Amino acid sequence: MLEVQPGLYFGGAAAVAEPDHLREAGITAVLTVDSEEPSFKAGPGVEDLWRLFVPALDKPETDLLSHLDRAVAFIGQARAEGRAVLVHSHAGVSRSVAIITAFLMKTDQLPFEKAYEKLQILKPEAKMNEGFEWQLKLYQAMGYEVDTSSAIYKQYRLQK
């Protein structure tokens, strides 16, 4: 695991491996970006845990742009309701980061590279593939928002 802001963390397998390790941090909401949606062990607090699953792989033609709005609102509402959010994936380097960045970006209208920086800082390991990169870049343009009934969107999706 690893923090990004007060009540913002991100990582991989060993992060959401054992949920008990979570109650340590004070996390009661978990956003997941992985090949398959996860299972958690019976444990205490696991049932009052928020969960949002973004279906994605680390491949460059994985549609993340269509989840950026929802993933950001989740982390947003999560915080507005109290809890520590954990954005994770098999290795919290691309998928995870990708969205972490996206949040940082929208929240304070930040230029892709500006927000992606603070992440490069915190984690040098940060290697977000090019697809998520231009998808995020594209987000800047759209106004850090995604108008599904927009020609840019409809085309983007058309291809992908």
UniProtKB/Swiss-Prot annotation:
Residues 1-145 form the Tyrosine-protein phosphatase domain. Ubiquitous, highest expression in spleen, testis, ovary, and peripheral blood leukocytes and lower expression in liver and lung. The active site is at S89 (phosphocysteine intermediate). Substrate binds at H90, A91, G92, V93, S94, R95. It comes from the Eukaryota. It is found in: Nucleus; Cytoplasm, Cytosol. Monomer. Dual specificity phosphatase; can dephosphorylate both phosphotyrosine and phosphoserine or phosphothreonine residues. Can dephosphorylate glucokinase (in vitro). Has phosphatase activity with the synthetic substrate 6,8-difluoro-4-methylumbelliferyl phosphate and other in vitro substrates. Belongs to the protein-tyrosine phosphatase family. Non-receptor class dual specificity subfamily. This is Dual specificity protein phosphatase 12. It comes from Homo sapiens (Human). The gene is DUSP12. The chain holds residues 27 to 186 of 340 of the full protein.
